[PDB]
């Protein structure tokens, strides 16, 4: 199920080298890049080539989780912690023990939780909400952001100390529009997925590929994948020329 990073560009070949180097280590990894540039693919790949490969891979979607329950969600809770605690759950961190914790959009993590994350990176311990008992954790952190963390540091919306703790081995994902030589290969890979998964089939003629190579791709590879899916419904087992592209994708 593991995905590979497809592409021949300078930038993507560089990311593969960096991945191979850091994967087997226990260093924290910060992956930086726009939405849809492969940051989670990079993260999953790092994990399954790590010492922790058979351990759990636990995502944390920093922006989504209701702030009311953020600390509970991340660190678990004991009972009578808060209104309607009742049951019992452990948090994302405890669940990730012996594995990898993946902090998707770390730029959205609120300051109070940044302090607590810094404790885990530094003391490798934590306490469930309500309990002042201390638990050891054994996790490797991989974080990703589309934000400018150094701007945030300046704005005081991101902690400098967490930053230097997390940014031990940064990996930059170039946006699609800077890797346009990879677009054909990405197309083949995406079409191959869709075929292997009984979800239709298409192929692009050279003109249509030229047109796509001139596109800005604000949604990067996720936007590319979206377009392949739509075209396979609009023109099943068809060949996509310039004229079958939606007008926004035409650049001639
Ligand atoms: N180089 C690549 N080779 C193959 N598939 C890729 C590549 N880059 C991205 N993908 C795929 O395109 C999609 C992009 O997914 P992600 O890796 O999650 O993007 P992202 O950078 O994590 O953006 P967010 O934070 O989830 S909005 C996934 O379906 C990936 O499998
Ligand atoms: Mg993701």
CA-to-CA distance for 121 and 169, rounded, in angstroms?
14
- Do 24 and 143 sit in the same domain of this protein? yes
CATH number, domain of 238, equals 1.10.8.60
What residues have their beta carbon closer than 5 A to ion ligand 2?
A: 40
Ligand approaching nearest to the C-alpha of 189: 1
Q: Contact, 168 vs 27, CB < 8 A?
A: yes
Q: Check whether residue 52 and residue 171 sit in a common domain.
A: yes
Substitution candidate for ligand 1 out of 34, 38, 228 with most atoms within 8 A of CB? 38
Nearest CA-CA partner of 42 in 96, 131, 104, 94: 104
Q: Domain boundary residue among 176, 197, 225?
A: 176
Domain boundary among 176, 194, 220: 176
Rounded Cα gap, residues 53 and 45, in angstroms: 9
| Residue count of the chain | 252
How many domains does the chain fold into? 2
Tokens of 38: 């492969």
138 and 232 assigned to the same domain: no
Ligand 1 atom index nearest CA of 37: 21
> d(Cα 68, Cα 24) in Å, to the nearest integer?
36
Indicate whether 47 and 129 sit together in one domain: yes
Token code pair at residue 66: 């209701």
Tell me, yes or no, whether 75 and 136 share the same domain.
yes
With beta carbons less than 8 A apart as the criterion, state whether 186 and 6 touch. yes
Cα 223 vs. chain centroid, distance in angstroms? 15
Among protein residues, the one with the nearest Cα to ligand 1's atom 1 is 5
Ligand located closest to 2 CA: 1
Are the C-beta atoms of 208 and 241 separated by less than 8 Å? yes
Resolution (A): 2.2
In this structure, which ligand is nearest to the CA of 217? 1
Ligand 1 pocket, Cβ-based, cut-off 6 angstroms: 3, 5-7, 33, 35-41, 104, 189, 221-222, 225
Distance from Cα 88 to the centre of ligand 1, integer Å: 34
Domain of 182 in residue numbering reads as 177-252
Q: What is the largest CA-CA distance in the chain?
A: 65
Same domain, 154 and 104: yes
Q: How do 57-61 and 135-136 pair as beta strands?
A: unpaired
Q: Which two tokens stand for residue 33?
A: 């890049």
Instruction: List the chain gaps (C–N > 2.5 A) by preceding residue.
Output: none
């Amino acid at each position: 199920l593991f995905r590979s990073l497809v592409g021949t560009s300078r930038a993507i070949q560089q990311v593969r080298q960096m991945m191979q180097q850091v994967a087997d280590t226990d260093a924290s990894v910060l992956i930086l890049g726009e939405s849809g540039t492969g940051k989670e693919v990079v993260a999953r790949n790092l994990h399954y080539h790590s010492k922790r490969r058979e351990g759990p891979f636990v995502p944390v979607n920093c922006g989504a989780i209701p702030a009311e329950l953020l600390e509970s969600e991340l660190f678990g809770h004991e009972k009578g912690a808060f209104t309607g605690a009742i049951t019992s759950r452990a948090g994302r961190f405890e669940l990730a023990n012996g594995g990898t914790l993946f902090l998707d959009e770390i730029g959205d993590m609120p300051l109070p939780m940044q302090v607590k994350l810094l404790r885990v990176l530094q003391e490798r311990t934590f306490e469930r909400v309500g309990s002042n008992k201390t638990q050891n954790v054994d996790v490797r952190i991989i974080a990703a952001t589309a934000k400018n963390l150094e701007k945030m540091i300046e704005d005081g919306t991101f902690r400098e100390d967490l930053y230097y703790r997390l940014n031990v081995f940064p990996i930059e994902m170039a946006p699609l529009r800077e890797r346009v030589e990879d677009i054909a290969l990405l197309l083949n890979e995406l079409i191959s997925r869709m075929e292997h998964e009984k979800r239709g089939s298409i192929r692009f003629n050279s003109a249509a590929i030229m047109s796509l190579c001139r596109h800005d791709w604000p949604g990067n590879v996720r936007e590319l994948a979206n377009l392949v899916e739509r075209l396979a419904i609009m023109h099943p087992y068809g060949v996509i020329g310039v004229g079958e592209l939606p007008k926004k994708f035409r650049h001639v």
